[PDB]
């Protein structure tokens, strides 16, 4: 057991999907995992382990923010033998052509945070995902007939940022989506030798100002989850 | 209802106690509040509103890290008329003379986060608590015969910091406790026009390594909650 | 004798009031101290030690700017056993509701100086005053029927700042007064193990431009000195 | 015609291969392209356009350092309609498990340069390559029986860096190779909406300097060019 | 009259020598100027105007630190028609070969301060003296048979710096002397269109740890002053 | 022989002239030096040694950007005993009173590069030329009836800077010319104990782009070389 996870080695699979919302983890466990057992509830950060098409898989919330997901992923990698982490969340759109229900894969992640600079002698550390995991995700989305956009995400420390001019910048440099963990998770993965990937569905559009709500929205969220789950299956083969 | 809180203007008191852990907010509602009523459960961030010796009070977790509490404190302040936020949590100590279970009042909060620099044109913004709130807490503590140090806290972005030596710097400058929120909450308070104070219980020494133990946790934690609740009363008078 | 103070251990009281202007230190010695004795004149930075209602007190100018007062406060603390430093000066206001002659207590001090970043590994060090000293001053002020705001000051390196807009940022974050020392004095206090507090008289509005006028200066200045001197008494009791 | 490219729109292909040394550009043109025609001589930075298996392609040296290649890549993107830039060169390794002559694909590029911060409001921009180009290169390498590693490169501003401890950091964070352009080219591509990729062959090892014959170097360099060239064909399919 | 100088246009010469110590200004006025009249005493910062070999010359203290000298030089340049400022002070040695009684001329000045970054969009502004003034100084020293070293000075914000490793750095890059104003004065000169120069005599040796005291020491200080005075005479011709 | 210079100690003179474009190096050698012998061909960066009025002198292109010239200047200083480096090239002007073909001597060089901060503990290093070399160049220019301006140059990392407002800043602070190497060469020279100078001729004007005939350009370029060459002779005297 670690400070934020009350479980023991073996309780988690070597791969863990991680949404920001713990309630979302329970939703993933019951919707896609068979024989899912809760392996953690500390601070209400629900974690589950089960199987997908016979493969052992875990899913657990990481809370909101780089500081939050950093603790959890680190504890998973160094104390529970987790070798892969796939964040599955929502991001805000900045690019006009990126429509809602578009699955976004963060090959890289820009950031507002100072954590990677702390780690990298105040230089620029390019926070990137594991290449194979990105490829597995793209191929899985393909097999499912889903159009995935691979590019840069932006991990912000302030969901309510005082600088709105930054969004024009993110747009100029092609940032595909804005969220709050990717850069943090990739920094932890590189620091402790594991692999990570972040997948997002666009729920908000800071461009055309139009969030999402319909059966269609929830269908895209599940597609993302399937992409994540199927991508690990391809990784095993 | 805001993006992370499903409640309506009026569901919250004008003062809100906030621990990091949502499960603690619940325990506080059940232990110190009468007519406890759950006003939010989005993302499992349990929020309660009740009464303490006649005063309307609210208690809701804020999650871990500056990005997490910044979201909640902001939404409470701008959409629920919350005037005062009182963070009640745990912190690690760096000063040898600061022993476990000690109660620390964060008059100020240092940080390695970039949030305030982003707000303050990259200059040094002194993240400070509201003076009256600090004084109220100091007084409530004396009335309860409890010792309470007043000074600087350090809000870290990385619980698992790769910069060990920074703790020597914290010690040299008198940091009373190491946590992960104060500086963010104080930043938001100044930005959105509210008042805040962070009270922390010394859960361990970053040096010695002695995580919370036995039933000591409850007494001290209850003392902190007692100090914060009473301080709110002295504040009204 | 230190490099900038020709005095000997014992020439100074354990508490020292310090205005920026050396000529003010003299006026204070003559006006409020009995048995006033000049203990330093190096670089014309007049220093005095006398008695106030029986208490041994010292008053010496610290010059203008963080680099200047850092030198003096440091030498007093490390070579003359000075335990408490109380800066008593003037400040420009940025908040419309803060009017001229207002008395401000710097609980905290923001700055655009790099001194604290150099001390704090380039992180954010919250330059704060000693809590008891702030409280003593707030009380001394009430006993004198004087209004005194408590909050953040901004210590600027450039009196003639080429960044006008920064004042809007100061206003937005509630800076009560703009001066040029607080943050440095608080930094030195933490570094060398002493206590400090900065009290300022609002000499004008950075906006309106209304430099000190008539005999109002003397009354208010004397009120500030009265508040600082009395605060030292409440401190001993 | 631009400040450093004396040619007209159409003279270059929509895809440009760029070696560090200009001499290599002429070699590439006469060794792998057919019907090559010179298109630029300014500053001795030779430029060539021709075909590889029917595909129109251009090659030209980009010089050493982020500033040099930023000039050329920018002009090609905005004035000659270039859509893809592939830098082909050498790099030094810091990882023991990375051998000389190993082919490294830079999915991302870290850097100690300020060009990206100046572009990104002083935040962390993750300088990444175009994902499809990365996979094309990996698949082309596989088809040619060549082993290819994908990950981070480090673009140094100083070949003779005053800091030797930084190499330990690079190793700790998995940097595959050290060179001097990638982060700059990726920044430029992002700024002007184009795609870029950097492929390097491990020339030396900052570790234990091994040894390679001019013959072995020849083979490796041609493998890198074929990879690059075949990757372009895969991209078209 | 300006906020820190109680004088009127004409009271100062268009050239002003400035030592840090106001008492030193009086020493210069009486030792080298004929018919010297005090033109300022605000805050005890003595200023004088007289003639040297028939030329109108002024001398005035600037206090200690960039923040201090910035105010004074700015007020002199923009309100008293001063076109030239020559700081004449003392500096600490860092280079072994730079002996005591060596006259140092700061063609440039490095710094710890953030003031020039505030002015220069956070970039590197090379704080330099006016070339002609440097040349006049070198020629004047020559005519007097004095060996002047021209190079870089280092303007520190902290006379008592917490980082001693910086001195090795200053030494590695050939900094000839350490003081506290040059960089500030050069920033003001460039900002308001005037010319400045800083001349120093080495009084302390942070290398061999040996200050200076003798008739010889005071002879070198006067040589520096003569150099400054004679250099302006050459400037007029 | 070094990584970028295939020559041996003695092949170069203790003084090296460096133009941006390598083609210019061959021109300088056959137009102003006698008995010239090639000493380097690596990467097409031609090197030559010979004599000018009996004085041994070398010339070789340094490429574009701080990173490029830093490599070459460092190797020449540490491996070929070079004592003086004179960069001769062009620059863009931002000051209206600075006309095309004007000769500019860089006593100092500002920059937006991080190389000097990385070298100087993140402080402001004033990248300055060797004073004697500056005066030699000014005197040589005078002797040749050429007008020469002395002051700051700005070494940009990005020829195509995203910020256009910075040019206003440069103008406000008197920058005489914009180029891309000076600050880097001065940094290197300071690091390895050598002397450097940068001389530029105003090629274009970021203001109103005027016009110059290839003939006028020829004349101006030769004037700059003579200046440089004659300045070396003056330095020897
Ligand atoms: C609109 C917005 N801004 C910042 N971070 C976000 N994550 C999701 N949506 C976001
Ligand atoms: C090491 C550390 N960092 C931040 N918050 C903490 N609480 C307890 N220990 C902590
Ligand atoms: C503009 C300004 N800056 C710093 N200190 C001051 N006191 C009065 N006005 C001031
Ligand atoms: C140390 C270093 N820096 C930059 N590029 C390189 N290629 C090989 N070694 C290198
Ligand atoms: C020793 C020392 N350190 C820092 N600044 C100084 N000015 C003069 N002497 C000095
Ligand atoms: C804009 C710019 N940047 C860098 N070097 C230059 N030479 C001429 N113009 C230039």
Coordinates of N, CA and C in Angstrom, one line a residue, chain B residues 10-75:
Chain B
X10 N -27.1 29.2 -3.0 CA -27.9 29.1 -1.8 C -27.6 27.8 -1.1
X11 N -27.1 26.8 -1.8 CA -26.8 25.5 -1.2 C -25.6 25.5 -0.3
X12 N -24.7 26.5 -0.5 CA -23.5 26.6 0.3 C -23.6 27.8 1.2
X13 N -23.0 27.7 2.4 CA -23.0 28.8 3.4 C -22.0 29.8 2.8
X14 N -21.7 30.9 3.4 CA -20.8 31.9 2.9 C -19.4 31.5 3.3
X15 N -19.2 30.5 4.1 CA -17.9 30.0 4.6 C -17.8 28.5 4.3
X16 N -16.7 28.1 3.8 CA -16.6 26.6 3.5 C -15.3 26.1 4.0
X17 N -15.4 25.0 4.8 CA -14.2 24.3 5.3 C -13.9 23.3 4.2
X18 N -12.6 23.2 3.9 CA -12.2 22.3 2.8 C -11.0 21.4 3.1
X19 N -11.2 20.1 3.2 CA -10.0 19.2 3.4 C -9.7 18.7 2.0
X20 N -8.5 18.1 1.8 CA -8.2 17.6 0.5 C -9.1 16.4 0.1
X21 N -9.2 15.5 1.1 CA -9.9 14.2 0.9 C -11.4 14.4 1.1
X22 N -12.2 14.0 0.1 CA -13.7 14.1 0.1 C -14.3 13.3 1.2
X23 N -13.7 12.2 1.6 CA -14.2 11.4 2.6 C -14.1 12.1 4.0
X24 N -13.1 13.0 4.1 CA -12.9 13.8 5.3 C -14.0 14.8 5.4
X25 N -14.5 15.4 4.3 CA -15.5 16.4 4.3 C -16.8 15.7 4.9
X26 N -17.0 14.5 4.5 CA -18.2 13.7 5.0 C -18.1 13.5 6.5
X27 N -16.9 13.0 6.9 CA -16.7 12.8 8.3 C -16.9 14.1 9.1
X28 N -16.5 15.2 8.6 CA -16.7 16.5 9.3 C -18.2 16.9 9.3
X29 N -18.9 16.6 8.3 CA -20.3 16.9 8.2 C -21.0 16.1 9.3
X30 N -20.7 14.8 9.4 CA -21.3 13.9 10.3 C -20.9 14.2 11.8
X31 N -19.7 14.5 12.0 CA -19.1 14.8 13.3 C -19.4 16.1 13.9
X32 N -19.3 17.2 13.1 CA -19.5 18.5 13.7 C -20.7 19.3 13.2
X33 N -21.4 18.9 12.2 CA -22.5 19.6 11.7 C -23.9 18.9 12.0
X34 N -24.9 19.8 12.3 CA -26.2 19.4 12.5 C -27.0 19.6 11.3
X35 N -27.9 18.7 10.9 CA -28.7 18.8 9.7 C -27.9 18.7 8.5
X36 N -26.8 18.0 8.6 CA -25.9 17.8 7.5 C -26.7 17.4 6.2
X37 N -26.4 18.1 5.1 CA -27.1 17.9 3.8 C -26.0 17.9 2.7
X38 N -25.9 16.8 2.0 CA -25.0 16.7 0.9 C -25.5 17.6 -0.3
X39 N -24.6 18.5 -0.7 CA -25.0 19.4 -1.8 C -24.2 19.2 -3.1
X40 N -23.3 18.3 -3.1 CA -22.6 18.0 -4.3 C -21.8 16.6 -4.2
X41 N -21.8 15.9 -5.3 CA -21.1 14.6 -5.4 C -20.4 14.4 -6.8
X42 N -20.4 15.5 -7.6 CA -19.7 15.5 -8.9 C -18.3 15.0 -8.7
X43 N -17.8 14.1 -9.5 CA -16.5 13.6 -9.4 C -16.2 13.0 -8.0
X44 N -17.2 12.7 -7.3 CA -17.1 12.2 -5.9 C -16.6 13.2 -5.0
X45 N -16.5 14.5 -5.3 CA -16.0 15.5 -4.4 C -17.2 16.0 -3.5
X46 N -17.5 15.1 -2.6 CA -18.6 15.3 -1.6 C -18.6 16.7 -0.9
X47 N -19.7 17.4 -1.0 CA -19.9 18.7 -0.4 C -21.1 18.7 0.5
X48 N -20.9 19.3 1.7 CA -22.0 19.3 2.7 C -22.3 20.7 3.3
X49 N -23.5 20.9 3.7 CA -23.9 22.2 4.3 C -24.8 21.8 5.5
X50 N -24.4 22.4 6.6 CA -25.2 22.2 7.8 C -25.2 23.3 8.8
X51 N -25.1 23.0 10.1 CA -25.0 24.1 11.1 C -24.1 23.7 12.2
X52 N -23.4 24.7 12.8 CA -22.5 24.5 13.9 C -22.8 25.5 14.9
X53 N -23.4 25.1 16.0 CA -23.8 26.0 17.1 C -24.6 27.2 16.5
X54 N -25.5 26.8 15.6 CA -26.4 27.8 14.9 C -25.9 28.4 13.6
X55 N -24.6 28.4 13.4 CA -24.0 28.9 12.1 C -24.1 28.0 10.9
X56 N -24.6 28.6 9.8 CA -24.6 27.8 8.6 C -23.2 27.6 8.1
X57 N -22.8 26.4 7.9 CA -21.4 26.1 7.5 C -21.4 25.0 6.4
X58 N -20.4 25.1 5.5 CA -20.3 24.1 4.4 C -18.9 23.4 4.5
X59 N -18.9 22.2 4.0 CA -17.6 21.5 4.0 C -17.5 20.6 2.7
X60 N -16.5 20.8 1.9 CA -16.3 20.1 0.7 C -14.9 19.9 0.4
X61 N -14.5 18.7 -0.1 CA -13.1 18.4 -0.4 C -12.7 19.2 -1.6
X62 N -11.4 19.4 -1.7 CA -10.9 20.2 -2.9 C -9.9 19.4 -3.8
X63 N -9.7 18.1 -3.4 CA -8.8 17.3 -4.2 C -7.4 17.6 -3.9
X64 N -6.4 17.0 -4.6 CA -5.0 17.2 -4.4 C -4.3 18.1 -5.4
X65 N -3.6 19.1 -4.9 CA -2.9 20.0 -5.8 C -3.5 21.3 -6.2
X66 N -2.7 22.3 -6.5 CA -3.2 23.6 -6.8 C -4.2 23.7 -7.9
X67 N -4.0 22.9 -9.0 CA -5.0 22.9 -10.1 C -6.4 22.4 -9.7
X68 N -6.4 21.5 -8.8 CA -7.7 20.9 -8.3 C -8.4 21.9 -7.4
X69 N -7.8 22.4 -6.3 CA -8.5 23.3 -5.4 C -8.8 24.7 -6.1
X70 N -8.0 25.1 -7.1 CA -8.2 26.3 -7.8 C -9.6 26.3 -8.5
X71 N -9.9 25.1 -9.1 CA -11.1 25.0 -9.7 C -12.3 25.1 -8.7
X72 N -12.3 24.3 -7.7 CA -13.3 24.3 -6.7 C -13.5 25.7 -5.9
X73 N -12.4 26.2 -5.5 CA -12.5 27.5 -4.8 C -13.0 28.6 -5.7
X74 N -12.6 28.5 -6.9 CA -13.1 29.5 -7.9 C -14.6 29.4 -8.1
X75 N -15.1 28.2 -8.4 CA -16.5 28.0 -8.6 C -17.4 28.4 -7.4

